[PDB]
Every structure is written in C-alpha cells, then in structure tokens.
Design a protein around this ligand. Structure first.
Ligand SMILES: Cc1cc(CC(=O)N2C[C@H](O)C[C@H]2C(=O)NCc2ccc(-c3cnco3)cc2)on1
Lengths: 142, 86, 99
C-alpha cells in the first residue's frame, strides 16, 4: 500500500470542512504514514504532491477517521486539465457507539477508566484507540 | 409507516420505521411496539435523534456536522448504543 | 428546506420532519395519521405561544437552524375538541445522574 513514485507534480488543495483539527497523512514509497502540518477547521491550503500518491485524514488529537472526497483514501489526479485537485475533508456519520467512545475518551484519562461502572467488554472497546497503523492493516485487505 | 418505542419511564417515541430499522437490535424486536425495560427516556430521545441524524446525513456531500453529546449523558448513551447495535 | 420537529404531548413524542414552507395545518394532518385524532380536536404550540393553522413552519419560527435533525425543535400538542381544550402539558425527561 504505497504511493507510486511518479515525479509528475500535482497541485492539490485541502479544504477542511470539519469541526476538527485535521492531520494530513502521506503514505510513503515504502508504506509508512508520514504526517504533515495540521489544518485548523474551516481552513484550506494549497499543496504540492504527485499523481498516484496516497493520503488520508484524521483528527490531529484523537486519530479518528475522516473522509476525503467521500472515500477513505486520496489519490491526486491529473494536475492540469484545469489545475488544482480538490480535497474536501469530512466527519462521517460515526456510528453512535464510536461517537460515544469519543466523548468518553475525551472526558476521562484512560489511566482512570476502570472506575467507570460499565461492562468490562466496554472498557476494552474504549481503551482501543483508533490507530493509523491499525487502520492501514485494516484498509489493506479489501 | 410508524413504530413506537417505549421508554422504561413510560415515555413513548413515535418514529418512522425507516429511521428505526437503523438499530439492528430494534430491526429484530419489530418484525408494532418495543418496550425497553432498561433505557430511560433521556436516552431514547438522543437515540431517536441519532436515527434521524443518521438517516439524514449518510451518503452526502453537504458537510456533515457534529452529533453533540452532553457529558452527563455519555455513559448511559454509550450503553444504549452498544445494546442497540448502532 | 426540511425542518425537523419533535411533536410532544403528555408522555408522547412524535419525531417528524416537514418542509419550512408547509403549514401548521398540514402538520395537524400528519398528526391525524399517527394518533388518529382529526385536526379540529387538536391545538399546536411552540413554547406556550398558540399556533395558527394557516401559518408556515418557517414563519412560526421553524428553520434549518432552529431544528437540526440532531437537535429538533419541540411542538406542543393538546386535545379535546370545541368541547373544552385540555391545558398545555408535557411530562419532562428523566434526569441524568452523577458525572
Ligand atoms: C519525487 C517525490 C518527492 C516526494 C516527497 C514530497 O515532496 N512530497 C510527498 C507528498 O507528495 C508531499 C510532497 C511534499 O513534500 N510536498 C510539499 C508539501 C509541503 C507541505 C505541505 C503541507 C502543508 N500543510 C499540509 O501539507 C504539503 C506539501 O514525493 N515524490
């Protein structure tokens, strides 16, 4: 799951249509996620990248998954035929459960999450942070 | 068209089947009414809200906004969430 | 615009959406289908103020920023026909614990 090493510069632009600080993530020629500087919500930026490179977006504070042009993964396309390629970054409809872990994650130090009377099985779901390395291992199947 | 979902504190929530069948749990208790012995109303209202906020916004450009969860309600919501599978 | 309401009365809450342009009275019909009571037997309120069947939701102050699917506005509902209307009454919601 790598970017193809073209050297065909492609001008993209990351519009952040989300309440969250988004962290753009370029996935390397080898596979490893590299992170760029983040985007305050609303906020756009012009970006130089390359055809067939791969990106993905998430909360810079709680690695949650956002979408880019409605899919999971961004590949910059034909840099011209008009010029910049448009990268719109969105909340999905999180499920109510994941959302519910979010607020709780954001409300309690995960040291002190064992004193929160709910089924053990929900303690495990909650200590289970979203991870890019995970999600990659996830996405990598389809 | 519509289905009722009965809180454990009496309260009744008429919602559309289409919005309802979002809970894989509820898809099966229907198939009409559903009592919930252990979900108070202050929860079932947010749930119903989620079904409308889910049914509205999925499959769409129109910048999806944040579903807001009030702290007081988080745990109890979390537990209905998991039970209702959604 | 679609507007998203929570039509409340006693221990009863209907969640429905409706156009902004549509009318108090059209909403009154939608109630007919559900609780089977004809528009004559029902009055409809927002926040005490008593609503008029000929006025648009938009104009009663229901907008796409008043009533967001995620936080839908409430509409009071009260019954019994010309033969004396019951007062406006809505049991509040179960209270949240600790923190
Ligand atoms: C050949 C070649 C070289 C490279 C490494 C590289 O220059 N990259 C990798 C990704 O395409 C990003 C691109 C890059 O470094 N672009 C410059 C850049 C700097 C800052 C940002 C930036 C700022 N805020 C968010 O992103 C975006 C692009 O990729 N192919």
């Amino acid at each position: 799951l790598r970017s193809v090493n073209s050297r065909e510069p492609s001008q993209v632009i990351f519009c952040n249509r989300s309440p969250r600080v988004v962290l753009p993530v370029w996935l390397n020629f080898d596979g490893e996620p590299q992170p760029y500087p983040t985007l305050p919500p609303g906020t756009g930026r012009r970006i130089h990248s390359y055809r067939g490179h791969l990106w993905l977006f998430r909360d810079a504070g709680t690695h949650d998954g956002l979408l880019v042009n409605q899919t999971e993964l961004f590949v910059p396309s034909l840099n011209v035929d008009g010029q910049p390629i448009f990268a719109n970054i969105t909340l999905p409809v999180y499920t109510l459960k994941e959302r519910c872990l979010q607020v709780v994650r954001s409300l309690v130090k995960p040291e002190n999450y064992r004193r929160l009377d709910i089924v053990r099985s929900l303690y495990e779901d909650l200590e289970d942070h979203p991870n890019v390395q995970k999600d990659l291992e996830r996405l990598t199947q389809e | 068209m519509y289905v009722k979902l009965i809180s454990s504190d009496g309260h009744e929530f008429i919602v559309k089947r289409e919005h309802a069948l979002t809970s894989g749990t509820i898809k099966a208790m229907l198939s009409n009414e559903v009592n919930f012995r252990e979900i108070p109303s202050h929860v079932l209202s947010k749930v119903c809200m989620y079904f409308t906020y889910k049914v509205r916004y999925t499959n769409s450009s129109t910048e999806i906004p944040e579903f807001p969860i009030a702290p007081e309600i988080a745990l109890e919501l979390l537990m209905a969430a998991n039970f209702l599978d959604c | 615009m679609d507007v998203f309401l929570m039509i409340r009365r006693h221990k009863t809450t209907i969640f429905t959406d409706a156009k902004e342009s549509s009318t108090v009275f059209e909403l009154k019909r939608i109630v007919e289908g559900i609780l089977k009571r004809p528009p004559d037997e029902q009055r409809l309120y927002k926040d005490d103020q008593l609503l008029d069947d000929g006025k648009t939701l938009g104009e009663c102050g229901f907008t796409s920023q008043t009533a967001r699917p995620q936080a839908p506005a409430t509409v009071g509902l009260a019954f019994r026909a010309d033969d004396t209307f019951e007062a406006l009454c809505i049991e509040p919601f179960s209270s949240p614990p600790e923190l």
